[PDB]
């Protein structure tokens, strides 16, 4: 058997099709079994329209061996484009076994696996082309977002979106997202997001009340500060050029949004700013974006 033929055949039973149908709509994607009780990780845009209109959409999981089972949304995170589904009382699930994306290196051979039975399903091959790659994602009413992504030249498309990025040990190192190089959500962020979605149905991320644009002191240029925000109270002014957030240099608006999410909620953090030719450090305490779940 081929080298990638073996790795793909060993993870196929862990990748499923995710189908969502209404009176006049249809959207399909892939998912991966991360827990033996029936927990499936997919990306948030695969299910977004079903989550927004659940009274009309029917969500279904289809396994490798043909079986078709209804599924429920446990939780979802548009900020990391992730979601958790649950199938009930299905036995002998081949659980995917999860790697460590911090141990991933540029040049590592990978496979972006889509659901073996999906309509337009794909399985592509490439290498890791970049790590911690901030990438913007923009198909429903959710927020646009940015993620620190694993970048690969394995093609990511409708057919393998939501399925796993797999290393040569048949371990999951990421979740493919199509929302011509590819991008995956690293598996360590997926464990954190999925771990907290399973228990609480929600995660909470820090927020500053800032929206930026990319700057020739380059960085993220403050376009608007929300009233009452942490940026408000910390001293951020509009047209500030943010160059550091916490311990992360900020090259543009994409890295800014990613850098904000790595911060601690309720702890003081320095924002280093280029203001009218000067450098100014400001202290900002991030609020939780979901204060009732915080």
Swiss-Prot record:
Ranges where the PDZ domain occurs: 192-250
Assigned protein family: Belongs to the peptidase S1C family.
GO molecular-function term, one example from the UniProt record: serine-type endopeptidase activity
Ranges in the topological domain labelled Periplasmic: 1-291
Record text about domains: The periplasmic region consists of a protease domain (PD) and a PDZ domain, connected by a ten-residue linker. Interactions between the PDZ domain and the catalytic domain lead to an inactive conformation.
Compartments, as annotated in UniProt: Cell inner membrane
Keyword list, A-Z: Cell inner membrane, Cell membrane, Hydrolase, Membrane, Protease, Serine protease, Transmembrane, Transmembrane helix
Name the UniProt record assigns to this protein: Probable serine protease HtrA1
Highest taxon above the source species: Bacteria
Function text: Essential protein that may act as a regulatory protease that is conditionally activated upon appropriate environmental triggers.
Broad class of enzyme this protein falls into: hydrolase
Its membrane topology: Single-pass membrane protein
Gene that this polypeptide is encoded by: htrA1
Residues at the catalytic site: 45 (charge relay system), 81 (charge relay system), 161 (charge relay system)
Oligomeric and partner information: The C-terminal region exhibits both monomeric and trimeric forms in solution.
Enzyme Commission (EC) number: 3.4.21.107
A GO BP annotation: proteolysis
A GO-annotated cellular component: peptidoglycan-based cell wall
């Amino acid at each position: 058997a081929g080298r990638f033929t073996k790795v793909a055949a060993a993870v196929a039973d862990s990748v499923v099709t995710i189908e969502s149908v209404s009176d006049q709509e249809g959207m399909q994607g892939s998912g991966v079994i991360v827990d033996g009780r029936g927990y499936i990780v997919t990306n948030n845009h695969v299910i977004s329209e079903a989550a927004n209109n659940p009274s009309q959409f029917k969500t279904t999981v289809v396994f490798n061996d043909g079986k078709e089972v209804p599924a429920n949304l446990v939780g979802r995170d548009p900020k990391t484009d992730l979601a958790v589904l649950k199938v009930d009382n299905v036995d002998n699930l081949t659980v995917a076994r999860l790697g460590d994306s911090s141990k991933v290196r540029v040049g590592d051979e990978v496979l972006a696996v889509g659901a073996p039975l999906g309509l337009r399903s794909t399985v592509t091959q490439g290498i890791v082309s970049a790590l911690h790659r901030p990438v913007p994602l923009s198909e429903g009413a959710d927020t646009d977002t940015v993620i620190d992504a694993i970048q690969t030249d394995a093609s990511i498309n409708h057919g393998n979106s939501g399925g796993p990025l797999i290393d040569m040990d048949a371990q999951v190192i990421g979740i493919n997202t199509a929302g011509g190089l590819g991008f995956a959500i690293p598996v360590n962020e997926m464990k954190l997001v999925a771990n907290s979605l399973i228990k609480d149905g929600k995660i909470v991320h820090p927020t500053l009340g800032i929206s930026t644009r990319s700057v020739n002191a380059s960085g993220a240029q403050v376009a608007n500060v929300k009233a009452g925000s942490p940026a408000q109270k910390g001293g951020i002014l509009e047209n500030d050029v943010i160059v550091k957030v916490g311990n992360r240099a900020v090259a543009d608006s994409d890295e800014f949004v990613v850098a904000v999410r790595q911060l601690a909620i309720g702890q003081d953090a320095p924002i280093e700013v280029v203001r009218e030719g000067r450098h100014v450090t400001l202290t900002v305490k991030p609020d939780p974006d979901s204060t009732l779940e915080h």
